[model samples]
Target chain A: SGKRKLITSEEERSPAKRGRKS
Target chain B: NWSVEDIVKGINSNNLESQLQATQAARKLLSREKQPPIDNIIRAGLIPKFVSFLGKTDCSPIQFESAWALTNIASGTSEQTKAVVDGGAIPAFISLLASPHAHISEQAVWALGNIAGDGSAFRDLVIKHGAIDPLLALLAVPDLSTLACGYLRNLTWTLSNLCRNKNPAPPLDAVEQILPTLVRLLHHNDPEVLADSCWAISYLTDGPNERIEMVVKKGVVPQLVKLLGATELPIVTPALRAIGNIVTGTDEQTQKVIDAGALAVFPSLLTNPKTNIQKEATWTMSNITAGRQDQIQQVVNHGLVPFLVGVLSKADFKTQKEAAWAITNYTSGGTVEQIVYLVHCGIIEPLMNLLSAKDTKIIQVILDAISNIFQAAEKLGETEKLSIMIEECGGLDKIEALQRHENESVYKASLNLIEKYF
Candidate 1:
């Protein structure tokens, strides 16, 4: 763990239908 | 209560009115509160017809409804998502991004977002069709009207999915074009916009130093550090992520985050009630501590040493692993005086306790940390005193027990430590 690579957070995706109402 | 048979029959008709009615029905059914009948809808073989409707210039309503339906379908299982892609939705959706109708364009953005979110291959496909420029144009809108904010949030999220996934990150040129937009969106009033914007930046900076430097040079560190203290977990998590990735760059870049007051924000995050946040905060600290002596000193100055030691002993195993990295990286990189400071902060007891951790990786780093501490104490001519402390803490027994560790490297390192020091 001493030589561990830096942590990068996972990417997020917004849910469908959460977009504004049509 | 409309059957898939009737909807498919309507959409299959050449009459524009009937096609529009069936597309509307499909959209309505897909958006239902519970199960959306996605499998049945796909079985009706309407995907290709709806995709064709996306190209109908004379009917923005049909395009909007079809895109909305496809967006929901793409939101289904990956096979369902692939069905839309195979039905030729990517180019159709990309074309609809230019729809003069705002609702159609927004729906297109929404549809593209779902497609990109499916996985890296689909996301790259979306990008290959040149979604970045239109997405950037939509985000660059200045008005900030209610509808514009909606576009901004969806666009930011879509952009995040675009920048996501490893084995092959989005091309640097495509990511470069969006960096400015991402930086600006960091300041948006909407929390979702802020969160997804940070997430995009997080993905953009996840790779080589060049990407991290691109984000750092944009002067977003202060805002990222500010976001570290944000109350919403959704907002704070990615904010922490982007900041963590930034610090993973060169030492100067790591210092930029530290200078932006990131260290001060970390103690609260390390103690945050959310265990994931605590783990992430500790992981971020490991990167900062991996920097030069001054960076490690800053971590010590902020009084995080004891908190990190607490995590090593008390947090969940995953978080404990991060804390182990933070502490061990410091021991390997920090000055003797700083390593000594770690000792006084009660790092020894918890560190020795972790020697018995089930994780061989944890065991390995703890050995490295202890070895570094012994070497530091030796340089200070206090090896005898430190050896006595280790003996008193029962670390000698842990090392002796590890002599037969199943891992060859662990056995060798354990034997080396005992023979050389104890």
Candidate 2:
């Protein structure tokens, strides 16, 4: 449970990365 | 029905019309195909031809029908399902899950579902072909209603099989990604979808404590308890298993399941004749008993202690071991009163018989139980009674005989018990 770094608030790591784009 | 000869010719023809005719022919046959004729279809070389159509072309209709045929073939025995996998359908099937057409991808997912459900080997093959990412991606498709009911059922069922695998469980990353979706799918209206989702949770938790905690942390225990009343083994079995694994986790985790009223359904499953159901139910009971004394009391108050001791002798070795393990854990953690309660339930004679088992693994565990029992007795000022009980039951002879065990740990464990008790 260390602090996690988020690259962007607009980005979700998993479903967004693997999901098909519009 | 077209002759196998005509089917082959249609498939082999160079023109699209003939190919489509071939696919249609294959589809018609497989639609009503029984297991008896599946080998004939494979012998006719229909497998590779159908597999080759998937993800190999955008021939919209042919790919769709061909995928259905392969899906039907997969619905047969493990041997039949392997024909599809061995024919190089794995990657093709995976690719089609992302097909440009909606129905084609749906059929492809259905095909992989049957393939994965065939058994662990083919299931692993599908995983090795990188099936999880796309499957999770497909599950994330929004607006899942009757509009895409077929797609959701197949998608969830296949994900269920993939998670429900063994021989090196689905990769940790895949489990981490799929856990949330599976937990969400539990509330879906479709029973098959809900059942398969529970299966995924069951399989994921079947691993190490970390994996069990993964599903537990996602709030799966309460949802799983709701589905236990399901009449079908497909739903009830995995839901029980998922809850079983949850109980194996930390004390608080086991408490989470008990708080969800799991004991409401836990005791009845123990009497079911199906060995698979009995085995899982017994395991869940064992882990529950292994918890702190109150949790152990909860399981006991449900009137399961006698059943636990009874299974020690009647159930299969695998199940017998689980029952013994539960008793062993109770001995390790239970108070002298609780220990005496089990002694009252007649845990002594069968436990002594298990002490003489040929399986060194079981013998070692029984040794630990013996130590715990006597230790509890010493604290309760009943050591003389326990010593006399062992002698009266002829258990003293068994313990004396174990002093010469080939396993060094068993020998030492036996020596320790003798020095401490006798």
Candidate 3:
């Protein structure tokens, strides 16, 4: 398995919420 | 739902081995439904939990299913795909793309295609993670060609999405590198493959004149003409879009499309039942007419004036905008004979009727085209007859009303028309 890790506190704060309809 | 919650709990469990098993099982359960409960899964916080498993390359099957879930997740709206990206899945997917396991690479390629294909920003995210080089390498592998059909289609689609930025596209050098690969794939037998190839090529040429000329230089013109007639809606739309953008290039570039049998194929597309097909075909003719007088004459020789009259007279308003823009270009580029040819074709009544359009832009284009007609008539010493025709068609009153327009340019153009012909 690849390194199993979750979203860090810092990364989730700066989430990439694009490519969806407005 | 209980289904997604349990999967999230499984991923968060202490046993790393069990965590892998839980996700591997989740893929089948998640994918079993055609439209899997993506909203439910993401709501349960399963997206980040699933992405966390991507850190383990030691277990190929575990990573494959993990990426597969992300693929399914990414297939949702931008917010859903953002769940996967928010979990920091990009680098993980990039690493998986270079993995020796084909299955792992395949799912990763698909996930990347979905994310990048979704929005301008997420697409940049895929490109910024250095996604392009490995993607091209995968497509360049001749030995894996037959076995990698699914991979190639997804890969091409991802690249096309990355290249589709409108305001500011990807780095020109990075985008230019894939043209040869895209053009070659245009000949692929599969409809999906060919559709994506055409789509990617459209994005590549959608930029400035240099990019447009770059694809044309690669012998894209003839290939596009061939694909325009493809029966698949997927194949036809992109092919027409690319050809439309291509015509927006130089006079010589526009002529290349015309000379490559566009005239024969393009008119039929104008009358297509699909509105978009008609829009693009109208845009193609608009650009063709926007070229030099000789270029306008090329299409005019094909009975383009009569064709424009027909399109403007009957098509819906969305389509009429393009048809009107084409006339705007024709009047700007056509000879006096051609402009008079428009008048003789009975264009005045319908063109006058379009002035009531709510869109100021469409109104302005119609006004410009009519003004050109009036000017052409004046040059021919036929203003007396032209004024009588404009009055009979209620065009003069319509132009007179626009003097109250809040838009400065339209107001000025309206006044210009009133002064020139009244």
Interface RMSD of 2: 15.9
Q: Write the per-residue lDDT of candidate 3 for residues B345-409, one digit (tens) a residue.
A: 88889898898888999998888887777778878899889878888989788889988888998
lDDT score, candidate 1, position B285: 89
Per-model CA lDDT versus the true structure:
0.83, 0.76, 0.76
**Residue-by-residue lDDT tens digits, candidate 1, B1-422:** 57799998898889999999989988888888788899899988899999999998998888888889888888888899999999999998888887789888988888888888777788888888888887777655565554566666777777777777777877778777878877777887789888888877887788888878878888999998898888888999889878877777788888899898998987798889899789888988888888888888888898888889888879988899998888888988999889988899888888888887898988988888888888898888998898889989999899999998899889999999888878
> Tens digits of per-residue lDDT for model 2 on B155-253?
787777777556667777767877777877887877778777876776677666777777788877778898876887778876876787677677887
**TM-scores for the candidates:** 0.92, 0.75, 0.83
**Where does candidate 1 stray beyond 4 Å?**
A1-3, A6-22, B143-147
Question: Where does the lowest 10-residue lDDT sum fall in candidate 3 chain B?
Answer: B141-150
Instruction: Arrange candidates, best lDDT first.
Output: 1, 3, 2
Q: What is the lDDT of residue B418 in candidate 2?
A: 79
Candidate that scores best on TM-score: 1
DockQ, per model, reads 0.25, 0.02, 0.02
Each candidate structure's count of clashing pairs:
0, 0, 10
